[PDB]
mmCIF file of all heavy atoms in Angstrom:
data_model
loop_
_atom_site.group_PDB
_atom_site.id
_atom_site.type_symbol
_atom_site.label_atom_id
_atom_site.label_comp_id
_atom_site.label_asym_id
_atom_site.label_seq_id
_atom_site.Cartn_x
_atom_site.Cartn_y
_atom_site.Cartn_z
ATOM 1 N N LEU N 272 224.909 120.545 49.974
ATOM 2 C CA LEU N 272 224.788 119.173 50.353
ATOM 3 C C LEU N 272 223.400 118.931 51.152
ATOM 4 O O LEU N 272 222.802 119.784 51.813
ATOM 5 C CB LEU N 272 226.018 118.766 51.191
ATOM 6 C CG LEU N 272 227.368 118.807 50.483
ATOM 7 C CD1 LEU N 272 228.570 118.650 51.575
ATOM 8 C CD2 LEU N 272 227.465 117.751 49.436
ATOM 9 N N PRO N 273 222.911 117.713 51.088
ATOM 10 C CA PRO N 273 221.636 117.374 51.557
ATOM 11 C C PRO N 273 221.572 117.213 53.072
ATOM 12 O O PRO N 273 222.510 116.664 53.718
ATOM 13 C CB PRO N 273 221.304 116.029 50.893
ATOM 14 C CG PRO N 273 222.634 115.445 50.775
ATOM 15 C CD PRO N 273 223.524 116.409 50.491
ATOM 16 N N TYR N 274 220.504 117.489 53.715
ATOM 17 C CA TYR N 274 220.189 117.139 55.087
ATOM 18 C C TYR N 274 218.685 116.929 55.274
ATOM 19 O O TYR N 274 217.880 117.238 54.411
ATOM 20 C CB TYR N 274 220.746 118.220 56.050
ATOM 21 C CG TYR N 274 220.006 119.358 56.081
ATOM 22 C CD1 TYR N 274 219.003 119.578 57.045
ATOM 23 C CD2 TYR N 274 220.171 120.488 55.171
ATOM 24 C CE1 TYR N 274 218.282 120.819 57.086
ATOM 25 C CE2 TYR N 274 219.341 121.681 55.231
ATOM 26 C CZ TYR N 274 218.448 121.698 56.158
ATOM 27 O OH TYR N 274 217.630 122.855 56.254
ATOM 28 N N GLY N 275 218.383 116.370 56.491
ATOM 29 C CA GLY N 275 216.927 116.251 56.844
ATOM 30 C C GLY N 275 216.174 115.117 56.293
ATOM 31 O O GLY N 275 216.743 114.205 55.513
ATOM 32 N N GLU N 276 214.889 115.035 56.590
ATOM 33 C CA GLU N 276 214.035 113.958 56.014
ATOM 34 C C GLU N 276 213.682 114.244 54.572
ATOM 35 O O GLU N 276 213.242 115.355 54.339
ATOM 36 C CB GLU N 276 212.715 113.916 56.922
ATOM 37 C CG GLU N 276 211.812 112.736 56.575
ATOM 38 C CD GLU N 276 212.509 111.333 57.017
ATOM 39 O OE1 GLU N 276 213.131 111.333 58.102
ATOM 40 O OE2 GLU N 276 212.349 110.336 56.356
ATOM 41 N N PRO N 277 214.045 113.253 53.844
ATOM 42 C CA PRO N 277 213.572 113.576 52.427
ATOM 43 C C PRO N 277 212.086 113.453 52.107
ATOM 44 O O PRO N 277 211.268 113.032 52.909
ATOM 45 C CB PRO N 277 214.184 112.362 51.708
ATOM 46 C CG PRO N 277 214.275 111.260 52.677
ATOM 47 C CD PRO N 277 214.665 111.928 53.934
ATOM 48 N N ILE N 278 211.670 114.010 50.998
ATOM 49 C CA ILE N 278 210.370 113.830 50.456
ATOM 50 C C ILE N 278 210.295 113.006 49.270
ATOM 51 O O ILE N 278 211.084 113.264 48.332
ATOM 52 C CB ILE N 278 209.624 115.212 50.233
ATOM 53 C CG1 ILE N 278 209.453 115.959 51.545
ATOM 54 C CG2 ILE N 278 208.392 115.096 49.624
ATOM 55 C CD1 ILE N 278 208.906 117.345 51.434
ATOM 56 N N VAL N 279 209.456 111.958 49.256
ATOM 57 C CA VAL N 279 209.336 111.035 48.136
ATOM 58 C C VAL N 279 208.361 111.649 47.104
ATOM 59 O O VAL N 279 207.404 112.339 47.476
ATOM 60 C CB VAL N 279 208.766 109.822 48.558
ATOM 61 C CG1 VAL N 279 208.494 108.821 47.315
ATOM 62 C CG2 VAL N 279 209.692 109.027 49.494
ATOM 63 N N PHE N 280 208.765 111.588 45.746
ATOM 64 C CA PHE N 280 207.836 112.059 44.686
ATOM 65 C C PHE N 280 207.764 110.933 43.571
ATOM 66 O O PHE N 280 208.664 109.998 43.510
ATOM 67 C CB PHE N 280 208.400 113.266 44.146
ATOM 68 C CG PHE N 280 209.749 113.330 43.480
ATOM 69 C CD1 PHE N 280 209.912 112.915 42.128
ATOM 70 C CD2 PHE N 280 210.733 113.790 44.301
ATOM 71 C CE1 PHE N 280 211.206 112.853 41.738
ATOM 72 C CE2 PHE N 280 212.080 113.721 43.853
ATOM 73 C CZ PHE N 280 212.327 113.251 42.419
ATOM 74 N N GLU N 281 206.641 110.900 42.942
ATOM 75 C CA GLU N 281 206.472 110.087 41.729
ATOM 76 C C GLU N 281 206.812 110.878 40.537
ATOM 77 O O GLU N 281 206.684 112.052 40.437
ATOM 78 C CB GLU N 281 205.007 109.349 41.686
ATOM 79 C CG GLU N 281 204.736 108.458 42.829
ATOM 80 C CD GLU N 281 205.693 107.284 43.074
ATOM 81 O OE1 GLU N 281 205.670 106.400 42.143
ATOM 82 O OE2 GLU N 281 206.614 107.340 43.953
ATOM 83 N N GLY N 282 207.287 110.210 39.437
ATOM 84 C CA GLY N 282 207.600 110.896 38.124
ATOM 85 C C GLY N 282 208.802 111.619 38.221
ATOM 86 O O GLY N 282 209.804 111.392 38.991
ATOM 87 N N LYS N 283 208.810 112.832 37.491
ATOM 88 C CA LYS N 283 209.882 113.649 37.305
ATOM 89 C C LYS N 283 209.930 114.730 38.382
ATOM 90 O O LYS N 283 208.885 115.394 38.744
ATOM 91 C CB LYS N 283 209.934 114.296 36.018
ATOM 92 C CG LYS N 283 211.097 115.292 35.625
ATOM 93 C CD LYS N 283 210.923 115.882 34.365
ATOM 94 C CE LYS N 283 212.245 116.469 33.749
ATOM 95 N NZ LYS N 283 212.639 117.751 34.398
ATOM 96 N N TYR N 284 211.004 115.009 39.096
ATOM 97 C CA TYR N 284 211.265 116.029 40.124
ATOM 98 C C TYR N 284 210.787 117.389 39.554
ATOM 99 O O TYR N 284 211.076 117.711 38.405
ATOM 100 C CB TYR N 284 212.753 116.192 40.472
ATOM 101 C CG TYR N 284 213.161 117.269 41.275
ATOM 102 C CD1 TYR N 284 212.869 117.263 42.657
ATOM 103 C CD2 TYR N 284 213.911 118.455 40.737
ATOM 104 C CE1 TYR N 284 213.234 118.372 43.520
ATOM 105 C CE2 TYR N 284 214.226 119.415 41.562
ATOM 106 C CZ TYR N 284 213.930 119.466 42.945
ATOM 107 O OH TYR N 284 214.288 120.469 43.655
ATOM 108 N N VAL N 285 210.029 118.085 40.380
ATOM 109 C CA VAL N 285 209.694 119.559 40.140
ATOM 110 C C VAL N 285 210.493 120.319 40.979
ATOM 111 O O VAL N 285 210.653 120.168 42.260
ATOM 112 C CB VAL N 285 208.154 119.870 40.293
ATOM 113 C CG1 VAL N 285 207.839 121.253 40.155
ATOM 114 C CG2 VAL N 285 207.321 118.948 39.308
ATOM 115 N N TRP N 286 211.113 121.376 40.457
ATOM 116 C CA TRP N 286 211.853 122.335 41.240
ATOM 117 C C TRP N 286 211.243 122.772 42.532
ATOM 118 O O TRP N 286 210.083 123.221 42.508
ATOM 119 C CB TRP N 286 212.275 123.517 40.375
ATOM 120 C CG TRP N 286 213.056 124.696 41.116
ATOM 121 C CD1 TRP N 286 212.555 126.016 41.239
ATOM 122 C CD2 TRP N 286 214.272 124.603 41.767
ATOM 123 N NE1 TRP N 286 213.439 126.756 41.983
ATOM 124 C CE2 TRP N 286 214.573 125.946 42.280
ATOM 125 C CE3 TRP N 286 215.275 123.656 42.008
ATOM 126 C CZ2 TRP N 286 215.666 126.268 43.030
ATOM 127 C CZ3 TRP N 286 216.361 124.061 42.691
ATOM 128 C CH2 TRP N 286 216.559 125.279 43.159
ATOM 129 N N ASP N 287 212.026 122.665 43.577
ATOM 130 C CA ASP N 287 211.641 123.100 44.947
ATOM 131 C C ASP N 287 212.738 123.930 45.505
ATOM 132 O O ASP N 287 213.748 123.201 45.936
ATOM 133 C CB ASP N 287 211.265 121.876 45.762
ATOM 134 C CG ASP N 287 210.630 122.229 47.191
ATOM 135 O OD1 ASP N 287 210.751 123.421 47.564
ATOM 136 O OD2 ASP N 287 209.878 121.404 47.685
ATOM 137 N N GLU N 288 212.658 125.163 45.639
ATOM 138 C CA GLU N 288 213.866 125.808 46.200
ATOM 139 C C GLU N 288 214.210 125.375 47.660
ATOM 140 O O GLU N 288 215.307 125.486 48.089
ATOM 141 C CB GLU N 288 213.611 127.445 46.219
ATOM 142 C CG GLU N 288 212.554 127.890 47.236
ATOM 143 C CD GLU N 288 212.669 129.392 47.366
ATOM 144 O OE1 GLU N 288 213.799 130.160 47.404
ATOM 145 O OE2 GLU N 288 211.602 129.960 47.618
ATOM 146 N N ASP N 289 213.206 124.879 48.407
ATOM 147 C CA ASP N 289 213.405 124.483 49.828
ATOM 148 C C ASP N 289 213.868 123.015 49.896
ATOM 149 O O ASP N 289 214.400 122.618 50.869
ATOM 150 C CB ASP N 289 212.110 124.570 50.566
ATOM 151 C CG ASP N 289 211.695 125.978 50.847
ATOM 152 O OD1 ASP N 289 212.432 126.906 50.685
ATOM 153 O OD2 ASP N 289 210.497 126.171 51.052
ATOM 154 N N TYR N 290 213.784 122.261 48.883
ATOM 155 C CA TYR N 290 214.284 120.862 48.674
ATOM 156 C C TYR N 290 215.043 120.812 47.348
ATOM 157 O O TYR N 290 214.474 120.067 46.288
ATOM 158 C CB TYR N 290 213.207 119.847 48.638
ATOM 159 C CG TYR N 290 212.543 119.626 50.029
ATOM 160 C CD1 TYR N 290 211.636 120.575 50.508
ATOM 161 C CD2 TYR N 290 212.825 118.420 50.848
ATOM 162 C CE1 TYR N 290 211.095 120.357 51.769
ATOM 163 C CE2 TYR N 290 212.221 118.348 52.071
ATOM 164 C CZ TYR N 290 211.357 119.264 52.525
ATOM 165 O OH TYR N 290 210.727 119.208 53.798
ATOM 166 N N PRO N 291 216.070 121.528 47.170
ATOM 167 C CA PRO N 291 216.785 121.870 45.864
ATOM 168 C C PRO N 291 217.752 120.727 45.326
ATOM 169 O O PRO N 291 218.149 120.835 44.192
ATOM 170 C CB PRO N 291 217.611 123.113 46.196
ATOM 171 C CG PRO N 291 217.960 122.926 47.649
ATOM 172 C CD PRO N 291 216.707 122.259 48.274
ATOM 173 N N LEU N 292 217.882 119.691 46.173
ATOM 174 C CA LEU N 292 218.665 118.481 45.623
ATOM 175 C C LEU N 292 217.784 117.348 45.496
ATOM 176 O O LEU N 292 216.825 117.264 46.268
ATOM 177 C CB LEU N 292 219.804 118.197 46.630
ATOM 178 C CG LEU N 292 220.859 119.192 46.880
ATOM 179 C CD1 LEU N 292 221.887 118.699 47.865
ATOM 180 C CD2 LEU N 292 221.497 119.649 45.565
ATOM 181 N N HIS N 293 218.021 116.453 44.602
ATOM 182 C CA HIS N 293 217.292 115.252 44.500
ATOM 183 C C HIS N 293 217.930 114.080 43.956
ATOM 184 O O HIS N 293 219.011 114.203 43.375
ATOM 185 C CB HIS N 293 215.992 115.513 43.735
ATOM 186 C CG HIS N 293 216.148 115.641 42.210
ATOM 187 N ND1 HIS N 293 216.612 116.834 41.610
ATOM 188 C CD2 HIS N 293 215.789 114.815 41.171
ATOM 189 C CE1 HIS N 293 216.680 116.641 40.266
ATOM 190 N NE2 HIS N 293 216.260 115.405 40.019
ATOM 191 N N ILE N 294 217.308 112.882 44.076
ATOM 192 C CA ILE N 294 217.792 111.703 43.431
ATOM 193 C C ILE N 294 216.605 111.285 42.655
ATOM 194 O O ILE N 294 215.506 111.158 43.132
ATOM 195 C CB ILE N 294 218.233 110.555 44.527
ATOM 196 C CG1 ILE N 294 219.465 110.910 45.199
ATOM 197 C CG2 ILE N 294 218.370 109.197 43.814
ATOM 198 C CD1 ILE N 294 219.871 110.097 46.406
ATOM 199 N N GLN N 295 216.909 111.065 41.375
ATOM 200 C CA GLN N 295 215.756 110.653 40.336
ATOM 201 C C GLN N 295 216.060 109.103 39.834
ATOM 202 O O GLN N 295 217.174 108.912 39.448
ATOM 203 C CB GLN N 295 216.017 111.580 39.128
ATOM 204 C CG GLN N 295 214.983 111.426 38.076
ATOM 205 C CD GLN N 295 213.489 111.736 38.385
ATOM 206 O OE1 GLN N 295 213.226 112.850 38.602
ATOM 207 N NE2 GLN N 295 212.706 110.702 38.395
#
């Protein structure tokens, strides 16, 4: 489950083991 400050990205999510959940 998610916690903390999110990081915004443009385009398609790239796998990040440290930010392993996302909303696309």
Side-chain angles (χ1 to χ4, degrees):
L272 298 168
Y274 74 94
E276 189 66 37
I278 294 177
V279 174
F280 58 86
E281 296 304 287
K283 188 182 190 282
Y284 171 78
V285 176
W286 171 240
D287 185 342
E288 73 166 327
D289 292 340
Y290 290 76
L292 298 181
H293 74 279
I294 290 169
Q295 179 71 66

